[PDB]
Amino acid sequence: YECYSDVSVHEEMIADQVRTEAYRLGILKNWAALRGKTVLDVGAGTGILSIFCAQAGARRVYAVEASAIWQQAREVVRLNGLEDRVHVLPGPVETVELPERVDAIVSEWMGYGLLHESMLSSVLHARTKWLKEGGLLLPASAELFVAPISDQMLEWRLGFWSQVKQHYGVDMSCMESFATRCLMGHSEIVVQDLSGEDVLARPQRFAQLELARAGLEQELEAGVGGRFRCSCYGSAPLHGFAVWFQVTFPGLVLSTSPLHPATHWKQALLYLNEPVPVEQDTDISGEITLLPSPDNPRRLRILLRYKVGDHEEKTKDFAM
Amino acid sequence: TKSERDQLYYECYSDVSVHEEMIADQVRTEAYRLGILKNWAALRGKTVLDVGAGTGILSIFCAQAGARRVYAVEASAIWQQAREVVRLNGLEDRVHVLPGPVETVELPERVDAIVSEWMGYGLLHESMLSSVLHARTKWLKEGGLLLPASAELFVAPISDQMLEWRLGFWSQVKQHYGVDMSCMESFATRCLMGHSEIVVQDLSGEDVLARPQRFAQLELARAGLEQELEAGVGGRFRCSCYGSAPLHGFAVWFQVTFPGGDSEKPLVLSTSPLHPATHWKQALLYLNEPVPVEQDTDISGEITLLPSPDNPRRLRILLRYKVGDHEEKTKDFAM
Ligand SMILES: COC(=O)c1cc(O)c2cc(NC(=O)NCCCNC(=N)NC[C@H]3O[C@@H](n4cnc5c(N)ncnc54)[C@H](O)[C@@H]3O)ccc2c1
Ligand SMILES: COC(=O)c1cc(O)c2cc(NC(=O)NCCCNC(=N)NC[C@H]3O[C@@H](n4cnc5c(N)ncnc54)[C@H](O)[C@@H]3O)ccc2c1
C-alpha cells in the first residue's frame, strides 16, 4: 500500500516500454471486441490502461484501485476528458460494488517469477464476481518457460578473483571457491537480466495458466508447474536454470524471455550449488513447481528437480 | 536490535559481494596502493596494524612497501579467506591475519603505523571510524603514522538532472502514449523530495550549481575526535550560484588524505562528483521542493553529521540553509 501509494513503482512500470507498449497494443488491437463494451480495470493504478481501453472504443471502464494512487487516477481521467466513461472506484476489487457485470477485464498483475507477490488472486476474484460469461480477459493466459543457462555475468564474477593479480599485483585466485559458494550455494531465487547467449538449450514451456478458469485460484496453492526435457546446444558450464513467463492477449504476447527485449521483470534464476560441465546434446530433464511459501503465501517458492545426463537426479528448494 | 544489526553486518562482510565491490572500486583501491607505497620511507622495517583488513589486500600492499610485520585484523568470516590470500602470496611470515574485532585483539607490541579503509556512505554512515580511533589509542606508538591521516567533507548545491527527469516524467507520458499525466507532477515532487531520507546516488559535474565548499576536516590523530563524533561533525558554508537552475538541495561527499609525499600536494582519494566515480557515490539532501535560483544567488548554511539516537552508526544530517533573501530553513535527514 505505501508502495503503490508512492510514485516510484508506477513510474517504473510505465517506464518499462516493452511492458507498457505491449499492454497498449494488446488493448488497442482488440478494438473490435471492446467497441461499445464495458471493462473492469483491476488495480488501475494511475489509470493509464483504462484510458487505452477508452481509446479502443469501450463504452465504459470501471477502474478499481486499492491504494491512495486512486486519487491521482481520478485526476488523470478528468484531465483527459474521460470522466463521462472512465470511473475510478477506490478500494479492493474484492469489496467494490460495480453497477453491472462487465464484458472485459484488463489487469497488469504479474510479479517476479510470475507469481511472487502478484495480484493474480484479485484478478481471479474479479473474474468470478464481475466478468460476464466468456468475457474478454486482457491478458487471457500466462505461459511459464524454463531453460538451462550458462550465466556470463556469474562467470565474470567468479573469475574476478583471478584477475586481481593483474589489476593490483596481489594474487587472490584462491577466492574462487569461496565466491562460488557464496554466489551459487544459497537457496535464493535470483532476479537478473540474462542474455540470449546465456541460454544453453531450447526453452521449454512447462506450465500454462488460463485466467478464465474457475478453480485456478485453489489450484495455485498446490503449485503450478510441470516436467521438462531438453538437449544442450554445446559445451559450457551449466549454472542452473532460468524461469520466465509470457502473457497472451486475445487476438499479441508480452514476453519476459532472455531472447526477447528486456523488461523490468528480468528472469528468475535458479543456480545449482556449483557449475556442472555439459557438452553438446547433453540431455537435461526435470520438474519445476511454483509454490506459495509456508510463512507468507505471497512469497514465491520454486521446487526444482533435475537430472543432468547420466548423473543422479537432484533437487533444490528455492525462495524469493 | 543491536544484536540483529551486528549479525547482519557479520553476514554481509562474510560474503563475497561487498569485497568484490570494494576491490573493483579502482579509484579506491589504487589510491590506497599508491598512498601506501608512496610511504615506503616511513614503513620500511616498521610494524603496521590494518584495521578491518577484509581480504588482506591493503596489508599486502604494506608488506610490498617494505613493512617488517603487518597485523591484519578482521572481524567477519572473511578473515579465513584473507589467511589464504596471504599464504598464496608467500607473505604469512610477515602478514599475520588475526580474527576478531580490533577492540579485543591482542598484539605483541604497539605498532608504528595504522592503515585502514574505514569510510562509509556520507563518510560516517556505518563507518569503522570508532574502531580505528580505538586502535589508535590502544595500539599506535606515540608519533605513529595514520594512513590515511585525515578526512575532509564537502558540500555543493545541486540541480539533479536525474531528479528533474523523474519529476518531469509525468508531463512526458502524453508524447509517448497519448495519455496526459501532467497533473501528477505535484504528487511526484512530494514523494521524491518531501521525505527526510539521505539519498545515495551518483551525480555528475553538470549537477553542481556552485563552487563546492569544504565544511569540515577530521584529523585522525586527535585524541578527542571521539567526543566530537557524538556531538556532531560539520560546519558552515557559503557559495554563489553559477547560473539559473532549479535548486534541488545539496550533495555531500568526502575525501581522505594520505601522509607523506609532497608536503604541499598530498595524495587524496576523492568521492567528488567532479572526479571519477567511486562506489560511495554522493549523499544527496533534497529540499521539500525545488527552489528557483539565479546567477550569483547566495546560499549559506550549516551541515552537521550526527549519530542517530537509536543507532549511533545510522547517519543523521542536520541541514540549516538560507537561499537568497528567503527565510533560513532547516531539514533533518537520516540514512
Ligand atoms: C486496504 O488494502 C489496500 O489498500 C491494499 C492491500 C494490499 O495487500 C495490497 C497489495 C498490493 N500488491 C500487489 O498488487 N502486488 C502485485 C505485484 C504487481 N502489482 C501491480 N501491478 N499492481 C497494480 C495496482 O493494483 C493495485 N491493487 C493490488 N491489489 C488490488 C486489489 N485487490 N484491488 C484493487 N487494486 C489492487 C495496486 O495498488 C497497484 O496500484 C498492492 C496494493 C495493495 C493495497
Ligand atoms: C563478529 O562480527 C560482528 O559481530 C560484526 C559486528 C559489526 O557491527 C560489524 C560492522 C561492520 N561494518 C563495517 O565494516 N562498516 C564500515 C563501512 C565499510 N566497511 C568496511 N570498509 N569494512 C572493512 C572490513 O572491516 C571489518 N570490520 C568492521 N569493524 C571491525 C572491527 N571493529 N574490527 C575488525 N574488523 C572490523 C569488516 O568485517 C569488513 O570486512 C562490519 C562487520 C561487523 C561485524
Residue numbers in the entry:
A (entry chain B): 51 to 301, 308 to 376
B (entry chain A): 42 to 376
What does the paper say about this structure?
Protein arginine methyltransferases (PRMTs) are important therapeutic targets, playing a crucial role in the regulation of many cellular processes and being linked to many diseases. Then, another series of compounds (12a–12h) were designed and synthesized, introducing also an adenosine moiety and exploring the distance between the three groups. We also report crystal structures with various PRMTs supporting the observed specificity and selectivity. On the contrary, we were able to cocrystallize the compounds in the complex with both PRMT4 and PRMT6.
Structure determinations and refinements revealed that only compounds 12a, 12c, and 12f are visible in the active site of each monomer of the PRMT6 dimer. Compound 12a is the only one for which a complete electron density is visible in one monomer of the PRMT6 structure, whereas for 12c and 12f the electron density becomes fragmented after the guanidine group and the density for the methyl-4-hydroxy-2-naphthoate moiety is weak. The crystal structure revealed an unusual distorted U-shaped conformation adopted by compound 12a (and probably also 12c and 12f) in the binding to PRMT6, with a folding at the level of the guanidine group. Whereas the adenosine moiety lies into its canonic binding pocket, the guanidine group of the compounds is unable to reach the PRMT6 double-E loop clamp because the linker with the sugar is too short, even for the longer compound 12f. Instead of binding in the arginine substrate pocket as observed with PRMT4, the methyl-4 hydroxy-2-naphthoate moiety is sandwiched between the adenosine and the side chains of Y50 and Y51 residues of the α helix motif I. Hence, the binding of compounds 12a, 12c, and 12f affects the proper folding of the PRMT6 alpha-X helix containing the motif I (Y50-Y51-X-X-Y54). If compared to the structures obtained in the presence of SAH, the binding site of the complex of PRMT6 with compound 12a is larger due to a displacement of the α helix and the flipping of the side chains of Y50 and Y51 residues to give room for the compound naphthoate moiety. As a consequence, the E267 residue of the double-E loop is not coordinated anymore by residues Y50 and Y54 of motif 1 and adopts a different conformation.
